[PDB]
């Protein structure tokens, strides 16, 4: 019988896998924890690399669609001196929500099962899935594309992501003043102040995404935030910075706390027939510019294998080796490199 394929997660990995499987004539459902009204809130910017994200879109028949919608407007990465506030200068881009929309727009209406938050995977008739809403399903193939805190990973491993000692505080400037819009430009502004850093990107709707990155223990942040709240704590950490960069920070309405976790480079799970992990589920690592690109490439490796080969279990097993070998080669530099951003 043609296999019942369950994808857990409607991120870039899960949607990329579902689209390649659908186009290969496979029966695929994606189970997404979030309700449909959740895309269109995410608008951070990213670029798809010619050897990963763009390969995945080509495999899914969407490379030209991506090229039609991408910005090719020569977005430059700028550097800011935290103390002088001086800015210097030294790749097809798409907002995160527009990437997810592109994949959703290419899929049949029924593909994604919204409000299906996986709570258990129970293996051998194949694999049982239980959802927080009480729904039960049975699948022959389960692709874990369920992100940093993958429930599918929790079925295969007791190993958890570890804190990096860095937390990003994410803010938005919906209508930047002329001065801060001109300072950031059309692209990115990166400011490394040691244990404080500031990462700003303009998205396709001329909104600024702000990451206030703090090297602080979770315990210290808990105490300070409990007392002062997020906004006061975040702004308080940059009082030694140039006035121009502090104004950029103070223009943010709210901040969300985004602890930066990573799986360890030595991460392993015992392979299980008919179950695998892709993207952040398989190899969550600090945000050094690989995550969406790897997620989509992983999805395309696994989905192509399931389309090309009649032995589904063996196809998945071979694709998993490639996913894991590729990620293990990148994770040490990602983990150590990220730490070196915050050295003093
Ligand atoms: C602050 C920050 C900045 C980043 N910047 C960049 C960047 O500039 N460039 C870049 O390439 N990457 C960046 N990343 C990394 C990137 O966001 C991720 O690597 C990428 O989104 C992973 O895709 P995915 O499909 O594996 O997982 P996700 O995109 O996390 O998708 C997982 C999906 O699974 C769903 N889900 C979770 N648990 C369940 C469950 N139990 N049942 C059902 N559904 C579930 C979630 O709702 C979600 O839709 C950044 C990350 C952070 C934290
Ligand atoms: Cl990343």
Author numbering: 3 to 92, 102 to 135, 138 to 357
Share the article's original sentences.
However, the genomes of several strains of this Gram-negative bacterium code for a FAD-dependent monooxygenase (SmTetX) homologous to tetracycline destructases. Activity assays using SmTetX showed its ability to modify oxytetracycline with a catalytic rate comparable to those of other destructases. SmTetX shares its fold with the tetracycline destructase TetX from Bacteroides thetaiotaomicron; however, its active site possesses an aromatic region that is unique in this enzyme family. The tetracycline destructases are classified as class A FAD-dependent monooxygenases (FDOs), which cover numerous proteins with diverse purposes and functions that primarily catalyze the hydroxylation of aromatic substrates.
Nevertheless, the structure of the protein could be solved using molecular replacement and refined at 1.95 Å resolution. The asymmetric unit consists of four SmTetX molecules with pairwise r.m.s.d.s on Cα atoms below 0.34 Å; the substrate-binding site remains structurally unchanged across the individual protein chains. There are two pairs of identical covalent dimers cross-linked via two disulfide bridges, i.e. chains A and B are linked via Cys172(A)–Cys172(B) and Cys281(A)–Cys281(B) disulfide bridges. The crystal structure contains SmTetX in the form of covalent dimers, which are most likely to be artefacts of crystallization. The overall structure of the monomer is divided into a smaller substrate-binding domain (residues Glu75–Ser99 and Pro176–Tyr274) and a larger FAD-binding domain (Met1–His74, Lys100–Leu175 and Ser275–Pro323), which are stabilized by a long C-terminal α-helix (Asp324–Arg364). FAD is observed in the IN conformation in our structure, i.e. FAD is elongated and its isoalloxazine moiety reaches into the re site. It is bound at the pyrimidine moiety of isoalloxazine and coordinated by the main-chain N atoms of the Pro300–Val303 loop.
